[PDB]
Design a protein around this nucleic acid. Structure first.
Ligand SMILES: CCCCCCCCO[C@@H]1O[C@H](CO)[C@@H](O)[C@H](O)[C@H]1O
Ligand SMILES: [Mg+2]
Lengths: 538, 403
RNA sequence: UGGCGCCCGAACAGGGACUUGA
């Protein structure tokens, strides 16, 4: 009695005509038996002459393929792109899980669209219900089940029902007997629509082994993460390990994945043994030690406040815990993404805070209170002196050892009594070699030949040379907007070794003023350094 | 009968994903959409509708009640032809010359006009759910939606009839509605302007139209010209910063020269060395200063081209913005003075309102903010019933030297 | 055979900063 969803093919298109796969001897009998069983059940009907279509079916089950029909049918709007997180589930006193036996098969199919699902075997059958694997079946089933549950959901505000693909997570704050009575009422309501569900001695008890999680009455976790303790490591093994401990990272805190992922850079073969780096081995040992003891999450409590605490563990790595009560956290996570070739600790912390904010809004629909390892003065300085509209919500300072700070600052005005370095760098595209150097108002000069370098690399090398050859206070004048912007971003770590050298040398310097002057305008010392480094490039 | 609406030929309705919303916003949206469905303004739809436009909840200015804000930017783009060509609303060039311009909201009147039956599909939106617990609630408009640029296009026939007695009674008041607001400009004393706005509100109420950033003064709008430093003693660093600034400005003002100023930076000198400007250098600096104070000559608004707005975070709560259609062809440069996200949202809304008042068209914004932060927090401070098209860029370090 | 999460690679487009030659 479920109202069918009106579906139609894409404009100016007709159902596919695909010949049967090469299977007519062994699986044919099983397919015929399955088709007869479905026809007896009423989910399958026979139409031979007036159904000029066909689809490729291959079996035992009958896995009918709708690859062609999927692209010939009008698109739907799926909403459940993601999956519910156990941390977002509300702590309910009693929880029952109902599986919908024959989920799709209980939802009828549009009468006009039934023909396009022709089902011919070496007979001509057509689906009367939602086919399996069809593009429209998931959305149609989800909408039909939402419609079916609406009368029950409205009449039972206390009962919470989360619908997955074919699973009903029914949670209630009622006593065991009342919850069982309501569950039987829900089962009868579903049966009124033909959706059969298991009875008392057919229902699955907890833990619920669901989508990689282990849902307990008052806690949640993941299935045991047994990492492969082997000597060799192929790219396939590294990918499997990274995925396994990325799954665990949402509950297990302190998980690091940077060296393991870095090992996957440039790899081409799926079996190429990788020389696990010493850093990677140490990180893997740390992850094993973290996974040694079990960790369980808690369910969301809307009455309490949602706190998010972030910790810096070095190498551009961040771990956060989201909790409401101390030492009992809903879920954990990590943020190691490097947004841009250059970044500093404060920008990375802002990105992590934004990621956690979006993640919490997705799971809990509310931003959490942030407990960040950054002083209020540091954040004030950064976001006041920064050119972006950076902002983090209400947050509280936590005095942890790995405090987030800025390791160097560029002077706002030239340093009186310091030395000025006019740095330039020229690169020859053809030969790929170039030069970098500097000139100083004191009268000094220096040009260092480079090789296999670009113009930007030459500019950075010139700046690095000036920093090396200058005292603790230096005025550096450059004509490269690229390097000027990089240095003014105040990066702490970079993907370039040269930029990291520049960063450490800036940290060494007590005062560093970086000025910019337009190139080729004949501005004092800039033209001199350009003439110096232009002999072999221009 | 309804007004048939057709998308641009060969182009398909919007399929924009719904951004996640907070619990309070979701609850507000659920309640207001239930009310609208009971009133018949929207209807629930099945999965056979592939189109979707993100919907947000905002609190209007000086109000605590929540308001729905459907992001019809994609639908506006896809109805561009319809709503701009065949039912366009002329923009009065005299609105920017009015002492006071009040901005009424008249979007509630659109819900009295049914939407074309064959177009309601594209006006489809989903209310999300927390933690994907339940499928999003899919709705669909049965009346002219707020935020769609074709709603004023269809309703202007009724709006002209409504306003005819008012305009005849006082032809010195300029009225102009862009999407959902009614920009009413007059050269009357603010008390008299408020009295006439109350009279217009009563007129709208008589004709069924309902009505509750709000009061603007386009007469007192001035551009933010480029200003050179005014120093008595000039250092090498100061002179070369000035030379760089003038070299960049010469891309805007062809008459800007830096020959004599650059002639001062002749050798390799310390940045703190004090260089006394020569007679020629001082004269050329004066000429550059005089050239800079006046606006650029030869920049004209092109209705064919889209307006572009660039915003620079100057720091200390101050923001500079430029409105242009071609690079270095600023139609308007200004400054906004006051939380970076809140200040940027206020600046964007003010710039868009100015663009509507002047050229009757919102600009495209190059926002100096990370994309995720904006898409997460812009709705927390938005107060307008419209949403401008924006993109996210990295402001060059030397472009923040607009002041 | 399809979706989701992660990683690599490629081509596209655009938003920018530079080198050289014509
Ligand atoms: C969060 C919304 C869905 C939660 C309910 C998921 C269905 C219950 O989880 C079930 O656990 C069983 C063992 O207990 C497993 O055999 C099944 O594969 C699994 O689906
Ligand atoms: Mg150079």
């Amino acid at each position: 009695p479920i109202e069918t969803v009106p579906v139609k093919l894409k404009p100016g298109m007709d159902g596919p005509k695909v010949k049967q796969w090469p299977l007519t001897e062994e699986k044919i009998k099983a397919l015929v038996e399955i088709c007869t069983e479905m026809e007896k059940e009423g989910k399958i009907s026979k139409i031979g002459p007036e159904n000029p279509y066909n689809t490729p079916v291959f079996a035992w089950r009958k896995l009918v393929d709708f690859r062609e029909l999927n692209k010939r049918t009008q698109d739907f709007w799926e909403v459940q792109l993601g999956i519910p997180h156990p941390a977002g589930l509300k702590k309910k006193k009693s929880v029952t899980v109902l599986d919908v036996g024959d989920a799709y098969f209980s939802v009828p199919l549009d009468e006009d669209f039934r023909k396009y699902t022709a089902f011919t075997i070496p007979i001509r059958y057509q689906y009367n219900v939602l086919p399996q694997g069809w593009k429209g079946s998931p959305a149609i089933f989800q909408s039909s089940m939402t419609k079916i549950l609406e009368p029950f959901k409205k009449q039972n505000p206390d009962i919470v029902i989360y619908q997955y693909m074919d699973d009903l997570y029914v949670g209630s704050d009622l006593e065991i007997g009342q919850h069982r009575t309501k569950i039987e009422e829900l089962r009868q309501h579903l049966l009124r629509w033909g959706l059969t569900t298991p009875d008392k001695k057919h229902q699955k008890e907890p833990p619920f082994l669901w989508m990689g999680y282990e849902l307990h009455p008052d806690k949640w976790t993941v299935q045991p993460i047994v990492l492969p303790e082997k000597d060799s490591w192929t790219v396939n093994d590294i990918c499997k390990l990274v995925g396994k401990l990325n799954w665990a990272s949402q509950i297990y805190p302190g998980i690091k994945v940077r060296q393991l992922s870095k090992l996957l850079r440039g790899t081409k073969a799926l079996t190429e043994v990788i020389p696990l780096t010493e850093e990677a081995e140490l990180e893997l040992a740390e992850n094993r030690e973290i996974l040694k003891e079990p960790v369980h999450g808690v369910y969301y409590d809307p009455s309490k406040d949602l706190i998010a605490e972030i910790q810096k563990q070095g190498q551009g790595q961040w771990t956060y815990q989201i909790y409401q009560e101390p030492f009992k956290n809903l879920k954990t996570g990590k943020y190691a993404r490097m947004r841009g070739a250059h970044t500093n600790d404060v920008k990375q912390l802002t990105e992590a805070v934004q990621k956690i904010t979006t993640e919490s809004i997705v799971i809990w629909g509310k931003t959490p209170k942030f407990k960040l390892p950054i002083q209020k003065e540091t954040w004030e300085t950064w976001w006041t002196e920064y050119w972006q509209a950076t902002w983090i919500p209400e947050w509280e300072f936590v005095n942890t050892p790995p405090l987030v700070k800025l390791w160097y600052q560029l002077e706002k005005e030239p340093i009186v009594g310091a030395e000025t370095f006019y740095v330039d760098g020229a690169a020859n595209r053809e030969t790929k070699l170039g030069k970098a150097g500097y000139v100083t108002n004191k009268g000094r000069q220096k040009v260092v030949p480079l090789t296999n370098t670009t113009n930007q690399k030459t500019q950075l090398q010139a700046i690095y040379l000036a920093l090396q050859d200058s005292g603790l206070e230096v005025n550096i004048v450059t004509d490269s907007q690229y390097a000027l912007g990089i240095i003014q971003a105040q990066p702490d770590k970079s993907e370039s070794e040269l930029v990291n050298q520049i960063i450490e040398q800036l940290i060494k310097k007590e005062k560093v003023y970086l000025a910019w002057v337009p190139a080729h305008k004949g501005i004092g010392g800039n033209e001199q350094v350009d003439k110096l480094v232009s002999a072999g490039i221009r | 009968e309804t007004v048939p609406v057709k998308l641009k030929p060969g182009m398909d309705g919007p399929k924009v994903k719904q951004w996640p919303l907070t619990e309070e916003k979701i609850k507000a949206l659920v309640e207001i959409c239930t009310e609208m469905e009971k009133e018949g303004k929207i209807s629930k739809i099945g999965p056979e509708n592939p189109y979707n436009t993100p919907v947000f909840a905002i609190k209007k200015k000086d109000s605590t009640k929540w308001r729905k804000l459907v992001d019809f930017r994609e639908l506006n783009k896809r109805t561009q032809d319809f709503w701009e060509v065949q039912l366009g609303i002329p923009h009065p060039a005299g609105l920017k010359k009015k002492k006071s311009v009040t901005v009424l909201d008249v979007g509630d009147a659109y819900f009295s006009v049914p939407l074309d039956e064959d177009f309601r599909k594209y006006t489809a939106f989903t209310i999300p759910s927390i933690n994907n617990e339940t499928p999003g609630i899919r709705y669909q408009y049965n009346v002219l939606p707020q935020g769609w640029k074709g709603s004023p296009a269809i309703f202007q026939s009724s709006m002209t009839k409504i306003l005819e007695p008012f305009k005849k009674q006082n032809p010195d008041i300029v009225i102009y509605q862009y999407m959902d607001d009614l920009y009413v400009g007059s050269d009357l004393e603010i008390g008299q302007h408020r009295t006439k706005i109350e009279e217009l509100r009563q007129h709208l109420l008589r004709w069924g139209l309902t009505t509750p950033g709000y009061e603007l003064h386009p007469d007192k709008w001035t551009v933010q010209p480029i200003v050179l430093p005014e120093k008595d003693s000039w250092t090498v660093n100061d002179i070369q910063k000035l030379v760089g600034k003038l070299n960049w400005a010469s891309q805007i003002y062809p008459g800007i020269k830096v020959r004599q100023l650059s002639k001062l930076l002749r050798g390799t000198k310390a940045l703190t060395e004090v260089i006394p400007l020569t007679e020629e250098a001082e004269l050329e600096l004066a000429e550059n200063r005089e050239i800079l104070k006046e606006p650029v000559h030869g920049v004209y608004y092109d209705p064919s081209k889209d307006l572009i707005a660039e915003i620079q975070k100057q720091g200390q709560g101050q923001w500079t913005y430029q409105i242009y259609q071609e690079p270095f062809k600023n139609l308007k440069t200004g400054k906004y003075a006051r939380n970076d996200v809140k200040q940027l949202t206020e600046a964007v809304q003010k710039i868009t309102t100015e663009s509507i008042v002047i050229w009757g068209k919102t600009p495209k914004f190059k926002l100096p903010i990370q994309k995720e932060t904006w898409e997460t927090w812009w709705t927390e401070y938005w107060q307008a019933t419209w949403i401008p098209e924006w993109e996210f860029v990295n402001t060059p370090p030397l472009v923040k030297l607009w002041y």
